[PDB]
Design a protein around this ligand. Structure first.
Ligand code: CPS
Ligand code: CPS
Ligand code: CPS
Ligand code: CA
Ligand code: CA
Ligand code: CA
Ligand code: CA
Ligand code: NA
Lengths: 132, 132, 132
């Protein structure tokens, strides 16, 4: 019965570093547990969730982390070969309680080549696997 | 109780563009909601589904889209560095109703380097997350 | 009611080939269905499971397979462009019965550039989609 899911896309490239990436294009976010203006997902239903993210790389390297309450729980890295775009993904099962927050963020200003556009979709998704 | 899931693999490289990619190798498709001869997934049970795809890149760039009823809902892109294969993935939560169709397709003839073989598996998967 | 999920990370790079990759860093493994010392996941609850893996490539090419009871069911490949790291992912729906085993393994010694570290996470995840 309990349901929570979302898939958001970034319409513009090179988000600011050291802060939640504000994916603004909504593909699905019916329960509104993800906030487009903050780029943060807030848990309302306790349980284990599955998160997945896909980023495109261009201009420079990309180092991105999946954060939980301000702490990085997973890092994904990919290097840019001059003149060629690349794509990198990551995913993880995370146990969440009410008010817990999850988001994506670029920790370092040097590896910030996160690319996205109307035709190249870097995205972020998540959904409740089992209520607990 | 309601169940719907599938994982299919492409046995040959470079599928035709502008049409559903016919993944022919079945890993799982018990409910038969995915059609190997059309490469189209048809919803029989309303609800939110999670789709995931993984493609290998070789020969030229790859631009692939996840389509819903003839309209692209997500694009994944990756460029081919001469002499080196690459791998790109994408995924999304999609709300579906009975008779809705979902598939993967290469929109452009110029970015059609979708590679696959008996030992390098480009795949397509999907499963019901929550009945509605 | 039935629940089974896990997400593990490899703390060191270049695991031994021809044997299960022993992901040692636990992100989630409450049901303990995955064994860190063997790198093998053993099914205790029959049903269809979804597995996902993400590897980073460095030094040489990477050819990795998702195995079920000693047989490869899916292969992912990615080539290393000298001086540039790459990232490759794969996923699949697998029907499992009690005592069935699933794991990741590098079949060939020539394509063993599987990289991982404290800041670059190659991971392996899986969870029960539907009990059967
Ligand atoms: C012709 C139409 C606009 C009207 C435009 C809109 C989006 C464009 C594509 C994407 O940008 C991805 C990729 C970027 C590469 O650089 C070159 C190849 C490719 C497939 C582009 C091709 C072509 O240019 C497109 C389809
Ligand atoms: C020796 C046996 C056939 C008997 C053949 C069957 C499939 C072959 C592999 C895959 O093709 C992927 C990859 C392609 C690269 O190009 C070179 C490396 C690698 C790992 C290949 C190596 C070797 O050649 C294989 C194992
Ligand atoms: C300054 C701190 C240690 C104190 C160290 C700890 C982990 C390091 C990063 C990762 O290694 C990934 C990546 C490898 C590239 O090679 C260079 C860029 C980047 C983002 C590294 C940058 C920097 O060096 C880091 C943050
Ligand atoms: Ca590339
Ligand atoms: Ca590559
Ligand atoms: Ca790269
Ligand atoms: Ca590359
Ligand atoms: Na990649």
């Amino acid at each position: 019965m309990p349901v929570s899911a979302f898939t958001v896309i970034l319409s513009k490239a090179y988000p600011a570093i050291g802060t939640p990436i504000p994916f603004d294009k909504i593909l699905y976010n019916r329960q509104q547990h993800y906030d487009p203006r903050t780029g943060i997902f807030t848990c309302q239903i306790p349980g284990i969730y599955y998160f997945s993210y896909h980023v495109h790389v261009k201009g420079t390297h990309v180092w991105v982390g999946l954060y939980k309450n301000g702490t990085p729980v997973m890092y994904t890295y990919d290097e840019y070969t001059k003149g060629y775009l690349d794509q990198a993904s990551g995913s993880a099962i995370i146990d969440l309680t009410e008010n817990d927050q999850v988001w994506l963020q670029l920790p370092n200003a040097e590896s910030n080549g996160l690319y996205s556009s109307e035709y190249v979709h870097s995205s972020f998704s998540g959904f409740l696997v089992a209520p607990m």
